Amino acid sequence: ANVEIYTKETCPYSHRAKALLSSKGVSFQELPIDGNAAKREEMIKRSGRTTVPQIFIDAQHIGGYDDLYALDARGGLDPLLK
Numbered sequence: 001a002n003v004e005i006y007t008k009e010t011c012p013y014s015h016r017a018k019a020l021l022s023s024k025g026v027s028f029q030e031l032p033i034d035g036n037a038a039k040r041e042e043m044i045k046r047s048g049r050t051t052v053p054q055i056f057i058d059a060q061h062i063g064g065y066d067d068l069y070a071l072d073a074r075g076g077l078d079p080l081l082k
């Protein structure tokens with residue numbers, strides 16, 4: 001398992017996902033693209049999407065935060081933690 005999540009300090013949609021991921025006790029690896037544009041633009045190569053947040057789990061992309069919420073609550077996120 002390798003949960004990654006792109007975040008930005010000045011981005012509340014980013015921090016939204018952290019209330020979820022903390023509620024679910026998830027072992028994410030947070031990528032602040034506030035003080036960074038390198039790994040930011042590495043994200044843009046990972047998925048083609050420019051915006052944050054974006055979650056990746058074992059190099060498979062999710063989508064946005066609402067996408068993750070549904071992907072969690074449906075049980076797509078949860079069993080990949082194993």
Ligand SMILES: *SC[C@H](NC(=O)CC[C@H](N)C(=O)O)C(=O)NCC(=O)O
Nearest residue numbers: 010011012013014050051052053064
């Ligand atoms: S909170 C920072 C910005 N987020 C969004 O705009 C999210 C948009 C959704 N993906 C959508 O539904 O379209 C952000 O990431 N801006 C990037 C930028 O171009 O500055």
